[PDB]
Amino acid sequence: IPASEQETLVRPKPLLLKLLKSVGAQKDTYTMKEVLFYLGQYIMTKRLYDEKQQHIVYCSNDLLGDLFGVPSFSVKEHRKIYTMIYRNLVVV
Ligand SMILES: CC[C@@H]([C@H](C)O)N1C(=O)[C@@](C)(CC(=O)O)C[C@H](c2cccc(Cl)c2)[C@H]1c1ccc(Cl)cc1
């Protein structure tokens, strides 16, 4: 994952926007660096990720699960994460 991908501008779909607004100000367009930070913040504040449970995020009991279509995922599989995130946004 090139660092250039983080500058990419995107517009979250309704569900993802609903998630993002619980941790950050609503915007029409976000850079991927913002989307990833806010998503990562949403995960930590809701403790869907216990750093003690070996890099796996558990989201079957959260909207995040409905967004990503999975019950859990590793914080280390970044390409998979990006694909799941793209399913929920539209590139500018
Ligand atoms: C939820 C944990 C979060 C913390 C806040 O930085 N996080 C990590 O813990 C990491 C250090 C896990 C790792 O690769 O070892 C980085 C991770 C991340 C950062 C930028 C892009 C991606 Cl796809 C993942 C990143 C992350 C960000 C968003 C999601 Cl959806 C998942 C993981």
From Swiss-Prot:
Instruction: Report residue spans for region: Necessary for interaction with USP2.
Output: 1-92
Phenotype for residue 40 to A: No effect on its ability to induce apoptosis
Location within or outside the cell: Nucleus, Nucleoplasm; Cytoplasm; Nucleus, Nucleolus; Nucleus
Q: Which superkingdom?
A: Eukaryota
Q: What induces it?
A: By DNA damage.
Region Sufficient to promote the mitochondrial pathway of apoptosis, as annotated, extends over 1-83
Summary of the tissues where the protein is detected:
Ubiquitous. Isoform Mdm2-A, isoform Mdm2-B, isoform Mdm2-C, isoform Mdm2-D, isoform Mdm2-E, isoform Mdm2-F and isoform Mdm2-G are observed in a range of cancers but absent in normal tissues.
Post-translational modification remark: Phosphorylated at multiple sites near the RING domain by ATM upon DNA damage; this promotes its ubiquitination and degradation, preventing p53/TP53 degradation. Autoubiquitination leads to proteasomal degradation; resulting in p53/TP53 activation it may be regulated by SFN. Also ubiquitinated by TRIM13. ATM-phosphorylated MDM2 is ubiquitinated by the SCF(FBXO31) complex in response to genotoxic stress, promoting its degradation and p53/TP53-mediated DNA damage response. Deubiquitinated by USP2 leads to its accumulation and increases deubiquitination and degradation of p53/TP53. Deubiquitinated by USP7 leading to its stabilization.
Ranges where the SWIB/MDM2 domain occurs? 8-91
Signal peptide start-end: none
Q: What does the function comment of this entry state?
A: E3 ubiquitin-protein ligase that mediates ubiquitination of p53/TP53, leading to its degradation by the proteasome. Inhibits p53/TP53- and p73/TP73-mediated cell cycle arrest and apoptosis by binding its transcriptional activation domain. Also acts as a ubiquitin ligase E3 toward itself and ARRB1. Permits the nuclear export of p53/TP53. Promotes proteasome-dependent ubiquitin-independent degradation of retinoblastoma RB1 protein. Inhibits DAXX-mediated apoptosis by inducing its ubiquitination and degradation. Component of the TRIM28/KAP1-MDM2-p53/TP53 complex involved in stabilizing p53/TP53.
The record describes its quaternary structure and partners as: Interacts with p53/TP53, TP73/p73, RBL5 and RP11. Binds specifically to RNA. Can interact with RB1, E1A-associated protein EP300 and the E2F1 transcription factor. Forms a ternary complex with p53/TP53 and WWOX. Interacts with CDKN2AIP, RFWD3, USP7, PYHIN1, and RBBP6. Interacts with ARRB1 and ARRB2. Interacts with PSMA3. Found in a trimeric complex with MDM2, MDM4 and USP2. Interacts with USP2 (via N-terminus and C-terminus). Interacts with MDM4. Part of a complex with MDM2, DAXX, RASSF1 and USP7. Part of a complex with DAXX, MDM2 and USP7. Interacts directly with DAXX and USP7.
Q: What else is known?
A: MDM2 RING finger mutations that failed to ubiquitinate p53 in vitro did not target p53 for degradation when expressed in cells.
What domain notes does the record hold?
Answer: Region I is sufficient for binding p53 and inhibiting its G1 arrest and apoptosis functions. It also binds p73 and E2F1. Region II contains most of a central acidic region required for interaction with ribosomal protein L5 and a putative C4-type zinc finger. The RING finger domain which coordinates two molecules of zinc interacts specifically with RNA whether or not zinc is present and mediates the heterooligomerization with MDM4. It is also essential for its ubiquitin ligase E3 activity toward p53 and itself.
Tell me what disease the record lists for it.
Seems to be amplified in certain tumors (including soft tissue sarcomas, osteosarcomas and gliomas). A higher frequency of splice variants lacking p53 binding domain sequences was found in late-stage and high-grade ovarian and bladder carcinomas. Four of the splice variants show loss of p53 binding.
Family the UniProt entry places it in: Belongs to the MDM2/MDM4 family.
Q: What is this protein called?
A: E3 ubiquitin-protein ligase Mdm2
Q: Which residues of the full protein are shown?
A: 19 to 110 of 491
